[PDB]
Design goal:
The structure is a homodimer. By secondary structure, chain A is an alpha/beta fold. Chain A folds into two domains: 164 residues, Aspartate Aminotransferase, domain 1, CATH 3.90.1150.10; 225 residues, Type I PLP-dependent aspartate aminotransferase-like (Major domain) (Aspartate Aminotransferase, domain 2). In chain A, 42% of the residues lie in helices and 13% in strands. The first copy, chain A, is built from 14 helices and twelve strands. In chain A, the strands form three sheets. A seven-stranded mixed β-sheet of chain A has the order 1-9-8-7-6-2-3, covered by helices on one side. Chain A is globular, with a radius of gyration of 21 Å. The termini of chain A are far apart. The interface between A and B is large, with 60 and 58 residues. The complex binds pyridoxal-5'-phosphate (PLP) (2 copies). One pyridoxal-5'-phosphate binds next to helix 4 and helix 9 of chain A. It is classed as transferase.
Amino acid sequence: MIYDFTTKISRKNLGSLKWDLMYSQNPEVGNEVVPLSVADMEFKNPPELIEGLKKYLDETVLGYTGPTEEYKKTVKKWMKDRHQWDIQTDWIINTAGVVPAVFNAVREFTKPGDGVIIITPVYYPFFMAIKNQERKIIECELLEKDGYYTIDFQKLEKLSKDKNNKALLFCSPHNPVGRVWKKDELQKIKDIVLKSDLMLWSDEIHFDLIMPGYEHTVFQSIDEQLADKTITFTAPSKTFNIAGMGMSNIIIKNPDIRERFTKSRDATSGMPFTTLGYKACEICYKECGKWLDGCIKVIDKNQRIVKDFFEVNHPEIKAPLIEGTYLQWIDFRALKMDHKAMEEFMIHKAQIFFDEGYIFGDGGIGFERINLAAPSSVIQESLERLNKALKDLK
Amino acid sequence: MIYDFTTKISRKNLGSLKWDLMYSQNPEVGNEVVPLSVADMEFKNPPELIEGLKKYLDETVLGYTGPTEEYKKTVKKWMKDRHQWDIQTDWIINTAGVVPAVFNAVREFTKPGDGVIIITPVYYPFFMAIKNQERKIIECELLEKDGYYTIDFQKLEKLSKDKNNKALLFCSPHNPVGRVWKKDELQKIKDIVLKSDLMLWSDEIHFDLIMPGYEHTVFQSIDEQLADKTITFTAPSKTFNIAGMGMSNIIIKNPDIRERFTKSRDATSGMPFTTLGYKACEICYKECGKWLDGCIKVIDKNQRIVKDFFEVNHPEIKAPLIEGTYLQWIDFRALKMDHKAMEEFMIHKAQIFFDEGYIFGDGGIGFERINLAAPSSVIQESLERLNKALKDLK
Ligand SMILES: *Cc1c(COP(=O)(O)O)cnc(C)c1O
Ligand SMILES: *Cc1c(COP(=O)(O)O)cnc(C)c1O
């Protein structure tokens, strides 16, 4: 199959939440502008998936649908071959998206007033899943040194000792800083977790999007006792740009926890009957491996394009390479602009639409998250607009 | 076009909930057997839909997607053209299925211990939506005389006086009895509702599947004040056999009720991001009207086959014609077999898989619901199989 990561596509007036958001923020945005905000790709989906879905549409009946044993086997096989992770078919529980699964986790395993620990700054829906259900957000801020983010273990161990805290909501790879947790880091966290009564909710939706050289370790794969009280969220959506196919594979080893998560889901959302969602995931894992390799190559090229751009044109702004995800963390703090001013400038002066750093927590103030999943030429067009805007800003 | 309502299809090992349930119940079931239980059709989807979805796939990106204004106008046009019902586009709230919407209504407009009135026997998920959320199921049993079901207005009024009951969860057309409510019946229910603090939740998922000779009336369309406190559940799933596309259109006129409903949805399932869900509904409404006409004819043709079948071979068993839906209600109380025992007989001796009447409430004990949405030849095969089983039964 021949893949395309070069065609500049347009998603204007097509129901794209990302594009509609851009036009809503700046009605005067040029027609040549492409948003680099929300985490979905500016690439057509894998050809095999599209051809596969069309083939399926000619065979199937779009009725009440559930996962086939083959589907489960395919997900189990992906975890094995791609992550040296041994799971069983009956460990897989499906939800229409990871966020709803997270909301469900909080709903079922905690009560109002209970605390949930998250490492910040981080993917904003985490905050929502907690406080929106009246639970307490317990922040364990990341330590940062010259752009490199690490875990505050002393503080984390302290928080785990607080009986009111019922679980650790973990992001791995960690959005938006692009960290792919090292084995030693995961070991320290594992010890803290097993030492307390904390449950482990590990969101590893970005675990297939790792940059060259780095290695992802499925958290619950390093210890069976840890796995006994862990809920791991996975899905093919971020990997193959199918967030609009709504299908997630939540892995839960413990029968008691699994059955509680399922009961709760069945009272809110219910079981996913989306036939194409099941098939899309199967097709991706079975046939879209080569496409993913090519996608990662382009992303790696793009993070280097960004890094180079600032080293050459505006050295005080830092865009370090990331370890995972296709979301790069750019440090604009040297501009000495508060986050509201930055946002205003990016949207109206540079017409570059990032996911403003501050939305991920106060630790993101001064930073900008750029979506690298676009053609290199598109990234270049955007940086040049920024270039002229920054120069004008003088 | 050439619409196929004759090809006997097989959905074995394809993830069909209906078929898998069948095999689970009778591993020895013959390969010639087709289930007539779960409410999805044993027909392939509308040609226009399939060609439209394939075309859409060649042009779209499967990312985070929301409804377009065109989508909304199309939903509005369908209500206007097909039901003489004037709705506004901002009245439309989307969910991934009607059942989740019902759970949402119960969770947001009532509290634990509150009562929700339902007219039984009825679609079983209704019971679950209430009971599994710690709410009280308040049954208002339908009156039955020679097969025809009517509303017990006296009981409904009595129950409406209990301030603990917060709403009436209505099914129109009514599954599983097949009643399409007359304006006279709806007006009488309305007066009872308007004189109380009862909210109205009208599940009208079957309102496009009306048999010749009858006409559905959207409940909230008969009175503006009733509409002010009514939540109407609609979707294209039952109509075009796309329960596997996960897209429902919940119509809520009142701004405050709507806002609350949406808030409740966002705290549990969030909005549907399904790209194909929105497109499938728009295609069906715009291009699949003729297919639907052909489908209803076969359903009408089949219900008459069932009716005549019993009158000729087992007249003590009654299967009267229905007014709406494609689910026919059969009275098997003349066999004097307790339900659990009768189910056993149907599953193993006759190898006919109905939706056992008792599952819809005690009022269904002794009845069987047959899915008419299948090729006429398939209905005949099934009936002939039960015929032998019945005779041998003696
Ligand atoms: C994108 C993203 C999700 C995905 O939600 P889906 O609805 O399953 O696509 C969950 N977690 C993080 C950390 C993400 O960045
Ligand atoms: C089939 C049916 C539904 C459809 O539910 P979905 O969640 O949209 O599949 C809802 N209500 C009744 C009365 C039905 O018979």
